[PDB]
Structure formats: structure tokens, C-alpha cells
Design a protein around this motif. Structure first.
Motif, PDB file in Angstrom:
ATOM      1  N   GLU A 286       0.895  -1.207  -0.012  1.00 40.49           N
ATOM      2  CA  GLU A 286      -0.045   0.094  -0.161  1.00 40.49           C
ATOM      3  C   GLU A 286       0.953   1.272   0.083  1.00 40.49           C
ATOM      4  O   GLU A 286       1.984   1.258   0.662  1.00 40.49           O
ATOM      5  N   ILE A 287       0.381   2.345  -0.625  1.00 43.14           N
ATOM      6  CA  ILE A 287       1.073   3.606  -0.577  1.00 43.14           C
ATOM      7  C   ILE A 287       0.232   4.637   0.442  1.00 43.14           C
ATOM      8  O   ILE A 287      -1.071   4.803   0.202  1.00 43.14           O
ATOM      9  N   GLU A 288       1.054   5.440   1.067  1.00 45.09           N
ATOM     10  CA  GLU A 288       0.658   6.234   2.349  1.00 45.09           C
ATOM     11  C   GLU A 288       0.943   7.720   1.903  1.00 45.09           C
ATOM     12  O   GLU A 288       2.204   7.859   1.653  1.00 45.09           O
ATOM     13  N   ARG A 289      -0.188   8.693   1.808  1.00 52.80           N
ATOM     14  CA  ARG A 289       0.210  10.046   1.457  1.00 52.80           C
ATOM     15  C   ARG A 289       0.104  10.930   2.863  1.00 52.80           C
ATOM     16  O   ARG A 289      -0.759  11.357   3.094  1.00 52.80           O
ATOM     17  N   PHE A 290       1.516  10.985   3.515  1.00 48.96           N
ATOM     18  CA  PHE A 290       1.431  11.532   4.807  1.00 48.96           C
ATOM     19  C   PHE A 290       1.653  12.806   4.702  1.00 48.96           C
ATOM     20  O   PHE A 290       1.384  13.567   5.661  1.00 48.96           O
ATOM     21  N   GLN A 291       2.111  13.255   3.294  1.00 50.15           N
ATOM     22  CA  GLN A 291       2.409  14.732   3.284  1.00 50.15           C
ATOM     23  C   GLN A 291       2.053  15.034   1.777  1.00 50.15           C
ATOM     24  O   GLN A 291       1.492  14.246   1.005  1.00 50.15           O
ATOM     25  N   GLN A 292       2.022  16.268   1.408  1.00 47.75           N
ATOM     26  CA  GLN A 292       2.275  16.730  -0.091  1.00 47.75           C
ATOM     27  C   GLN A 292       3.462  15.945  -0.799  1.00 47.75           C
ATOM     28  O   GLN A 292       4.530  16.033   0.100  1.00 47.75           O
ATOM     29  N   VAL A 293       3.194  15.295  -1.659  1.00 50.21           N
ATOM     30  CA  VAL A 293       4.398  14.434  -2.156  1.00 50.21           C
ATOM     31  C   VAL A 293       5.567  15.306  -2.515  1.00 50.21           C
ATOM     32  O   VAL A 293       6.818  15.123  -2.422  1.00 50.21           O
ATOM     33  N   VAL A 294       5.365  16.749  -3.124  1.00 48.05           N
ATOM     34  CA  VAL A 294       6.273  17.750  -3.414  1.00 48.05           C
ATOM     35  C   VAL A 294       5.827  18.639  -2.885  1.00 48.05           C
ATOM     36  O   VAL A 294       4.730  19.627  -3.103  1.00 48.05           O
ATOM     37  N   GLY A 295       6.802  19.284  -1.659  1.00 48.41           N
ATOM     38  CA  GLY A 295       6.223  20.564  -0.854  1.00 48.41           C
ATOM     39  C   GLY A 295       6.546  21.840  -1.611  1.00 48.41           C
ATOM     40  O   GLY A 295       7.779  22.037  -2.199  1.00 48.41           O
ATOM     41  N   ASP A 296       5.735  22.947  -1.136  1.00 48.62           N
ATOM     42  CA  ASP A 296       5.983  24.161  -1.742  1.00 48.62           C
ATOM     43  C   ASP A 296       7.135  24.975  -0.662  1.00 48.62           C
ATOM     44  O   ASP A 296       7.110  24.753   0.544  1.00 48.62           O
ATOM     45  N   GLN A 297       7.713  25.820  -1.439  1.00 48.83           N
ATOM     46  CA  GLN A 297       8.889  26.656  -0.754  1.00 48.83           C
ATOM     47  C   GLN A 297       8.740  27.962  -1.248  1.00 48.83           C
ATOM     48  O   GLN A 297       8.581  28.348  -2.255  1.00 48.83           O
ATOM     49  N   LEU A 298       9.042  29.123  -0.340  1.00 56.22           N
ATOM     50  CA  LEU A 298       8.961  30.381  -0.485  1.00 56.22           C
ATOM     51  C   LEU A 298      10.226  30.714  -1.701  1.00 56.22           C
ATOM     52  O   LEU A 298      11.215  30.288  -1.486  1.00 56.22           O
ATOM     53  N   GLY A 299       9.982  31.918  -2.697  1.00 58.47           N
ATOM     54  CA  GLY A 299      10.716  32.335  -3.544  1.00 58.47           C
ATOM     55  C   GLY A 299      10.788  31.130  -4.789  1.00 58.47           C
ATOM     56  O   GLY A 299      10.082  30.180  -4.789  1.00 58.47           O
ATOM     57  N   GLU A 300      11.550  31.499  -5.719  1.00 59.34           N
ATOM     58  CA  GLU A 300      11.740  30.857  -6.948  1.00 59.34           C
ATOM     59  C   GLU A 300      12.706  29.649  -6.969  1.00 59.34           C
ATOM     60  O   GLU A 300      13.623  29.606  -6.342  1.00 59.34           O
ATOM     61  N   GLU A 301      12.521  28.823  -7.916  1.00 58.04           N
ATOM     62  CA  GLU A 301      13.304  27.575  -8.040  1.00 58.04           C
ATOM     63  C   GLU A 301      13.758  27.575  -9.552  1.00 58.04           C
ATOM     64  O   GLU A 301      13.032  28.034 -10.542  1.00 58.04           O
ATOM     65  N   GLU A 302      15.135  27.124  -9.699  1.00 55.79           N
ATOM     66  CA  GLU A 302      15.435  26.658 -11.180  1.00 55.79           C
ATOM     67  C   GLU A 302      14.693  25.852 -11.673  1.00 55.79           C
ATOM     68  O   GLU A 302      14.838  25.942 -13.086  1.00 55.79           O
ATOM     69  N   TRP A 303      14.452  24.782 -11.138  1.00 53.33           N
ATOM     70  CA  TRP A 303      13.537  23.553 -11.915  1.00 53.33           C
ATOM     71  C   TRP A 303      12.337  23.583 -11.277  1.00 53.33           C
ATOM     72  O   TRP A 303      11.826  23.743 -10.129  1.00 53.33           O
ATOM     73  N   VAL A 304      11.212  23.527 -12.134  1.00 54.70           N
ATOM     74  CA  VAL A 304       9.773  23.547 -12.101  1.00 54.70           C
ATOM     75  C   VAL A 304       9.090  22.171 -12.200  1.00 54.70           C
ATOM     76  O   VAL A 304       9.276  21.779 -13.226  1.00 54.70           O
ATOM     77  N   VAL A 305       8.400  21.737 -11.466  1.00 55.39           N
ATOM     78  CA  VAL A 305       7.915  20.355 -11.376  1.00 55.39           C
ATOM     79  C   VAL A 305       6.530  20.676 -12.067  1.00 55.39           C
ATOM     80  O   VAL A 305       5.647  21.402 -11.590  1.00 55.39           O
ATOM     81  N   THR A 306       6.174  19.878 -13.002  1.00 57.19           N
ATOM     82  CA  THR A 306       5.098  19.790 -13.879  1.00 57.19           C
ATOM     83  C   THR A 306       4.240  19.009 -13.363  1.00 57.19           C
ATOM     84  O   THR A 306       2.581  19.017 -13.195  1.00 57.19           O
ATOM     85  N   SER A 307       4.349  17.740 -13.041  1.00 54.76           N
ATOM     86  CA  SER A 307       3.617  16.833 -12.250  1.00 54.76           C
ATOM     87  C   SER A 307       4.561  15.546 -11.880  1.00 54.76           C
ATOM     88  O   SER A 307       5.436  15.575 -11.977  1.00 54.76           O
ATOM     89  N   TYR A 308       3.819  14.763 -11.295  1.00 52.57           N
ATOM     90  CA  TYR A 308       4.530  13.512 -10.465  1.00 52.57           C
ATOM     91  C   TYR A 308       3.593  12.484 -10.306  1.00 52.57           C
ATOM     92  O   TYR A 308       2.203  12.425 -10.560  1.00 52.57           O
ATOM     93  N   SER A 309       4.258  11.108 -10.056  1.00 60.06           N
ATOM     94  CA  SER A 309       3.455  10.027  -9.841  1.00 60.06           C
ATOM     95  C   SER A 309       4.343   9.005  -8.888  1.00 60.06           C
ATOM     96  O   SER A 309       5.400   9.239  -8.710  1.00 60.06           O
ATOM     97  N   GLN A 310       3.652   8.232  -8.135  1.00 58.47           N
ATOM     98  CA  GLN A 310       4.318   7.105  -7.448  1.00 58.47           C
ATOM     99  C   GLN A 310       3.760   5.665  -7.510  1.00 58.47           C
ATOM    100  O   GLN A 310       2.465   5.692  -8.008  1.00 58.47           O
ATOM    101  N   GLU A 311       4.429   4.683  -7.531  1.00 60.98           N
ATOM    102  CA  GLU A 311       3.916   3.221  -7.936  1.00 60.98           C
ATOM    103  C   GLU A 311       4.984   2.195  -7.355  1.00 60.98           C
ATOM    104  O   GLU A 311       5.979   2.332  -6.886  1.00 60.98           O
TER     105      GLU A 311
END
Ligand code: C14
Ligand code: C14
Ligand code: D10
Ligand code: D10
Ligand code: D10
Ligand code: OCT
Ligand code: OCT
Ligand code: OCT
Ligand code: OCT
Ligand code: OCT
Lengths: 316, 80, 160
Positions: free
Chosen positions: A144-169
Motif C-alpha cells: 500500500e502507498i501512504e500519502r502522509f504529506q504533499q509528495v512535493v512541498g512548496d517553498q518561498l521564492g523561485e526555483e531553477e527547476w519547476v515540477v509540472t507533474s509527479y507519480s508514485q508506483e
């Protein structure tokens, strides 16, 4: 169930921060949290042994603890790990039923040869994190997979790399000394900040090219020659000024190809300017005017055709 | 605030006593006596009857050792 | 050179006594045989040598197993391109006398030539052409000025 069955493991992972990427060596580094849960009556326990409801082990791996209590546990590894891993808040705790769980906060560097930078800066990549059980599937299996947090968390300010989507399997893969082991994969799909590259590189390049294009309206070919010569040096200066955003990988990207083509056209402008100056010197001004009209018509067509060709051969 | 449930267990969780609702149903009380050489006690108060988000319910808890007049103490907390 | 990073390290044995060892490794190897005189047109060998730490009368490498592709494929381009490889068993002299077995894997490699050609040689050729073409002019002041400018352009490109 006459046949003794296997143990079922619940697993979860969350990413806090992508902390770096090595494009030459082809690896990335990440900060995150890992969680495992399972149930085993051999871990059973009587409260009058301690007068307590929870038994625990701290700052030790699952392998170490298995070697202390001499019972098998679901040990794991990160499949692509390079060097040592830094860990915080590492703990295992167990109840009288035998319900057990593991927690870790990690910082780790992972190999990634699947990276492909041909389309740079318009390239797109996958950051995949793979967790493998170190024991056979008939002993333990991710279930079983547990979602105990947001899988990819937000942070203040900009990032060099931008996450468009994710998955877990969850999947299953072949194991040494035969059989098979469980695998848990998290994958992030990422792109670059396009406005940065566009505004920083392409607009000034376009203006420099326009400068060498516009001078063909002049009929004083000495001024045209001098301005062409100056513009070529300006082009080289700008190229070495932006050389910091030009990764040295040992093979060509889209941007290097565009820079080479631009340089070559800028130098051909000077060559044509010298030819037109000589032609005017010898008294054939009409041929020089006709060359001016031809260049003014042709050059933007050549740039547009090159852009179309690049789009066809790299993005479809 | 609604009346919560009250019970008494040892350090391992073995139940020992349960709270009784008085005929003037505005309080719950409990009582126990010691038999073993050493007894360690744990007092449970829980209001998880369902899943209602009642908010900021607040209760007053009075406890005493060898003090059977807890109903009308009168004196301020003495002893320890 | 220095320490080696290892993963999935295991030994397992059967009642017959049939035994086997597995390791996934990351390692850094000294290579003074490198020779860069012909750069960028140079060609090199990456050789990996595994030696038994015991005398040949105790243990000897006897057979080679191809459990995977010897050099595996990866998505995208690489700086170094493998043209061919080979694998071989030999025997070499040992401390406290006698001899030990050695297993060698060697990769033959070259650089991406298009990168260097397109990035360096064509712009150089155009710059040289610029200083060559100006001798058709008969106004020697213009020729002097263009030569002077082209020299600075050459230096700028070189440091670029
Ligand atoms: C090459 C830089 C772009 C400049 C704009 C070109 C637009 C096309 C205009 C063609 C005009 C021809 C007049 C003889
Ligand atoms: C030096 C850059 C190469 C330019 C091409 C030279 C080709 C040879 C032509 C010789 C012409 C001589 C005319 C007097
Ligand atoms: C390599 C570029 C050759 C250009 C030749 C120009 C001919 C001009 C003579 C007037
Ligand atoms: C940023 C790239 C600009 C390249 C030249 C544009 C020429 C367009 C002619 C219509
Ligand atoms: C997805 C964007 C496609 C880029 C095609 C044109 C590239 C021009 C050379 C930089
Ligand atoms: C990071 C912005 C994505 C591209 C925006 C285009 C604006 C020039
Ligand atoms: C005003 C500058 C135009 C630059 C266009 C090229 C970048 C998309
Ligand atoms: C693909 C690179 C070609 C470089 C020279 C182009 C001259 C018009
Ligand atoms: C990496 C390509 C090898 C050399 C090709 C020559 C094309 C300019
Ligand atoms: C082989 C590189 C020198 C030739 C460059 C020709 C440029 C059009």
C-alpha cells in the motif's frame, strides 16, 4: 490459510527540496522524508516487561536492529545512491500487538544517466527516486502507498527547476540469489524557467543581428564596412559574456548551434562588405546596389528557414 | 460541554475502575482502593464519542488521595 | 585511488560448497598511460584491472562470464564514445614470490569530433578569410584599419 503467507508493508515518501543537479556527471541531490509500516506477531510483547505501551530503537538502521533482536525485518536501500547518505530523526517503534513503523529524514545524491540535454534550454527531464526491499518477495512485499504529506512541498521564492507533474508506483524486480523483490518509485517531471533564458539571451542576440542587417541600406560602403567590423567584435564580446550560461558537456546543444550559425552569418556580412567596397572603388555601383537588395531580402529568410529546420529535427 | 468518559488504568493499561454518572447528571466520579505493594495509576479522560468537531470544550478535573470529601473540599489544594 | 563505494555486497553458499560474490561499485582509477599530444584528435584506453590477492597455486581465474552487456547503453549523448572493447585473463608476479591471476577489461575511446570542428575550426577559418580578403583593396588606410580590427577580433575569439 494452510500456506503460510507473506508480510505486507505500507510505504510513503515526500520531497522537501531539490538541492542540486550535475549535468556533466549526470546526478541530482534531494531532501525528503521516508515512512514504513507493518505488523508481525513475533514482535509481540508483554507490558509488564517494562510497565510501558511502546518499545523503540533510535539512530540505527533496520539492518542493525535486525541483528540485535535476531528476527527478520524489511530492510531497504536507495537503488542509485552515490556515496553515503545523511540521516536525521531515525527511529523504529513497536506496540504489544507487534505493529511496527520506521521513520527517517534524508539527504541523498542519486545517479541519473537517463538525463538527455540535446534540446537545451528547451529540454525536459525526469527525477526518479527508487526504494528497493533488500529481502525476497515471499518474505516482505510493498502492498500500500501512504500519502502522509504533499509528495512535493512548496517553498518561498523561485526555483531553477519547476515540477509540472509527479507519480508514485509499486512494482517487482529480479533479485540476487534468484526470486524477486519489491520496488517503490517516485518520479517528478521537470522543466526550466523559460523567461530567464529568453530575456537574457535571445532578445539581445536578435538586436545584434538586426544591427548587422540594417547597415545594407547605406550607400557609403566604408561606413558599412566599419560598422560590420565593429558589430562582429560586439557579437564575440556578448558571446563570451553569456558563456556562463553555456554548459560544457562535450556535445552540441540547440543554443551552441544557433550561436555558430549567427557568428558565421555575421562574418559573411563583413566579407560581402569588403567585396562591395572594392566594387564601388572600380566603378560598378549598380552591382553593389543589387547585392544590397539581394542581401536585404535573403538574410531573414535564411534565419527563418534555419529556425524551422531546427524545430523539425529536434522537437517532432 | 458534553460530559466525557472517565476510567482508571495501571501503567500497562489494565482497567481497574470506570466512572459513574451521578443522578444529578452534571459530573462523573471514580473511586479505587490499593491492594498491591506498589500501584501506579493512570487517569484517562476522553470525549471521542463520535467525530463531532465541537471546538474548545473545557473541563475541570479534581483529584485527591486519601481525601473522600472531594465533593466539598473547601480548603485550597493541600499536601502535594 | 582512495576509497571505493560499494552497494548490494553479498556472498552466498550452497550445501555442495558452490559459492558466489556480487558487488555494485563506483571507483576512481589512476591512468598515466594517457597521451594527449594529438588533442582533440586523440584516442585513449580505459583499462580496469582486477587482481587476486592470493597465490596462483591456491586460486586462479579460469573462465569469463558475460552476465550483461560489457558496456551498457544510456539515453542521450556522451563526451567519450566507445569504439570497441575486450576482456582477458593473464598472470603476473606476486609479493613473497610466485604469481597471481589478473582479469583486465579495456575500452577504446574517442571524442565527439563534430563538437570541436563546428565550435572552433569554422569560425577560425572565417576570421582568417577576413584578413585574407582585404588585400584586394587599393585604399591602404582601410586595409590597415580592417587588419587592426581583425586582430582584436581574433584575440577575443581565442579567449572566448
Ligand atoms: C534580419 C533581422 C530582421 C529585420 C527585419 C526584416 C523584415 C523583412 C523585411 C524585408 C525588406 C526588404 C527590403 C528590400
Ligand atoms: C586564406 C583563406 C582562404 C581563401 C581562399 C584562397 C583560395 C586561393 C585563391 C588564390 C587567388 C590568387 C589571386 C591573385
Ligand atoms: C573565403 C571567402 C572568399 C571571398 C572572395 C571575395 C572575392 C572578392 C574580389 C573582389
Ligand atoms: C533569437 C533568435 C533571432 C534570430 C533571427 C530572427 C530573424 C527573423 C527574420 C524574420
Ligand atoms: C520548444 C521550442 C522550440 C525551439 C525551436 C527553435 C530553436 C531556435 C534555436 C535556438
Ligand atoms: C518562466 C516563464 C516561462 C516562459 C514565459 C515566457 C515569457 C517570455
Ligand atoms: C524586441 C526584441 C525581439 C527579440 C525576439 C527574439 C526572442 C524571441
Ligand atoms: C550547422 C553549422 C553550420 C555553420 C556554418 C553556416 C554558414 C552559413
Ligand atoms: C561526432 C561526429 C563525428 C565527426 C562528424 C564530422 C561532422 C562535422
Ligand atoms: C574544416 C573547418 C574549416 C572549414 C570551414 C569552412 C566554413 C564554411
Amino acid at each position: 490459510s494452510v500456506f503460510l503467507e507473506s508480510d505486507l508493508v505500507t510505504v510513503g515518501l515526500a520531497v522537501d527540496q531539490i538541492v542540486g543537479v550535475d549535468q556533466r556527471s549526470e546526478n541530482f541531490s534531494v531532501v525528503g522524508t521516508l515512512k514504513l509500516s507493518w505488523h508481525d506477531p513475533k514482535l509481540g510483547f508483554s507490558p509488564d516487561q517494562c510497565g510501558c505501551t511502546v518499545k523503540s530503537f533510535e539512530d540505527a538502521s533496520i539492518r542493525a536492529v535486525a541483528g540485535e533482536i535476531n528476527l527478520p525485518l524489511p530492510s531497504f536501500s536507495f537503488y542509485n545512491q552515490q556515496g553515503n547518505r545523511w540521516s536525521q530523526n531515525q527511529v523504529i517503534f513497536v506496540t504489544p500487538d507487534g505493529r511496527a513503523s520506521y521513520f527517517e529524514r534524508f539527504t541523498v545524491t542519486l545517479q541519473a544517466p537517463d538525463f538527455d540535454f540535446l534540446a537545451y534550454p528547451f529540454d525536459r527531464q525526469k527525477f526518479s527516486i527508487k526504494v528497493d526491499l533488500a529481502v525476497p518477495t515471499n518474505m516482505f512485499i510493498f502492498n500500500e502507498i501512504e500519502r502522509f504529506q504533499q509528495v512535493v512541498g512548496d517553498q518561498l521564492g523561485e526555483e531553477e527547476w519547476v515540477v509540472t507533474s509527479y507519480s508514485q508506483e509499486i512494482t517487482e524486480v529480479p533479485f540476487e540469489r534468484g526470486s524477486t523483490n519489491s520496488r517503490f518509485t517516485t518520479t517528478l517531471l521537470v522543466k526550466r524557467n523559460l523567461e530567464y533564458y529568453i530575456l537574457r539571451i535571445f532578445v539581445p542576440l536578435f538586436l545584434i543581428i538586426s544591427v548587422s542587417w540594417v547597415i545594407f541600406f547605406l550607400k557609403d560602403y566604408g561606413r558599412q564596412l566599419e560598422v560590420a567590423s565593429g558589430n562582429l567584435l560586439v557579437f564575440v564580446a556578448f558571446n563570451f559574456t553569456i558563456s556562463g550560461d553555456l554548459p560544457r558537456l562535450g556535445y552540441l546543444t540547440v543554443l551552441d548551434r544557433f550561436m555558430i550559425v549567427s557568428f558565421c552569418l555575421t562574418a559573411i556580412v563583413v566579407l560581402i562588405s569588403v567585396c562591395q567596397k572594392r566594387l564601388g572603388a572600380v566603378g560598378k555601383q549598380a552591382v553593389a546596389a543589387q547585392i544590397d537588395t539581394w542581401v536585404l531580402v535573403i538574410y531573414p529568410l535564411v534565419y527563418s528557414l534555419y529556425i524551422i529546420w531546427v524545430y523539425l529535427r529536434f522537437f517532432t | 460541554a458534553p460530559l466525557p468518559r472517565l476510567r482508571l488504568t495501571d501503567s500497562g493499561g489494565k482497567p481497574l475502575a470506570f466512572g459513574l454518572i451521578d443522578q444529578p447528571g452534571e459530573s462523573v466520579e471514580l473511586n479505587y482502593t490499593c491492594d498491591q505493594d506498589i500501584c501506579e495509576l493512570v487517569v484517562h479522560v476522553d470525549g471521542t464519542d463520535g467525530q463531532k468537531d465541537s471546538g474548545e470544550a473545557v473541563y475541570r478535573l479534581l483529584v485527591g488521595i486519601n481525601a473522600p470529601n472531594l465533593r466539598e473540599s473547601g480548603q485550597t489544594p493541600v499536601g502535594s
